[PDB]
Ligand binder design. Structure first.
Ligand SMILES: [N]S(=O)(=O)[C][C][C]C1234B567B89%10B%11%12%13B85%14B%1158B%12%11%15B%139%12B%1061B%12%112C5%153B%14874
Ligand SMILES: [Zn+2]
Length: 258
């Protein structure tokens, strides 16, 4: 009886195994755009993905992860609200059963169809497992997805999904360029928060981009053909793999833009 997204094991149950679910800096949150304060001390974000080396794509039973070689400083995030250098380890998505839900963060209570998370760890802690034990250990870049025009840079991901339909399947996934998943603008909101899945550790500086990317209905429909179950098990479509907004508590969301 492991955690997942269903009504007997989903987000309202997670606190029993992970009591930090009811902590002081949980994610995601609703971004109230009129209350977020412009902070002129915030720096532009530096996203350096020119040397990113993807290796593999994995269906972990919750989502799919596109994994990178993080054994050297290649793909790094810096600037913005961050002190120091954060190395890209993986990306994944959260999405819905229908286009009206799927994102984890919300904007003035608006839910997007999906949300991309690019996960990076702070190199000053040496490895990812040490980073997640620190309040400034991770930086996750969050990008909203809306349904309209296709995202050409997403199509390589979409086309490999048939080969990782079920939990525990992986596939080689080299030379994928995550620059093709970024919007034009790097304007962002930022706040201190947590992982949005168990173990829910309070280790993340969230950077949520204001500009969504557009993906096609066909692209998101292929996300929704994945399975939460393993091969040879009854089919449970991989949809609605998002945690709802959590209480903001004693936090301020800052905006990089006027
Ligand atoms: N939504 S999120 O906060 O970016 C957490 C994504 C899930 C996981 B998978 B395992 B390790 B791998 B890394 B940390 B652990 B789970 B948390 C992030 B990724
Ligand atoms: Zn995530």
């Amino acid at each position: 009886h492991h955690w997942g997204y269903g009504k007997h094991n989903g987000p309202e149950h997670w606190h029993k195994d992970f009591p930090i679910a009811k902590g002081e800096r949980q994610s995601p949150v609703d971004i109230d755009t009129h209350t977020a304060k412009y902070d002129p001390s915030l720096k532009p974000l530096s996203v350096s993905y020119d040397q990113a080396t993807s290796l593999r794509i994995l269906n972990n039973g919750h989502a799919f992860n596109v994994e990178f070689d993080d054994s050297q400083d290649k793909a790094v995030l810096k600037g913005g609200p961050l002190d120091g250098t954060y190395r890209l380890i993986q990306f994944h998505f959260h999405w819905g059963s229908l286009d009206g839900q799927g994102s984890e963060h919300t904007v003035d209570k608006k839910k997007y169809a999906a949300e991309l998370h690019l996960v990076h760890w702070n190199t000053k802690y040496g490895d990812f497992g040490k980073a997640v034990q620190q309040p400034d250990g991770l930086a996750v870049l969050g990008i909203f997805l809306k349904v309209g025009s296709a995202k050409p840079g997403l199509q390589k991901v979409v086309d490999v999904l048939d080969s990782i339909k079920t939990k525990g399947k992986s596939a080689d996934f080299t030379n994928f360029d995550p620059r093709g998943l970024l919007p034009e603008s790097l304007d962002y909101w930022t706040y201190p928060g947590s992982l949005t899945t168990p173990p829910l550790l309070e280790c993340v500086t969230w950077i949520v981009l204001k500009e969504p990317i557009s993906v096609s209905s066909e692209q998101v429909l292929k996300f929704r053909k994945l399975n939460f179950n393993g091969e040879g098990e009854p089919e449970e479509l991989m949809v609605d793999n998002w945690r709802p907004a959590q209480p903001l508590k004693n936090r301020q969301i800052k905006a990089s833009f006027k």
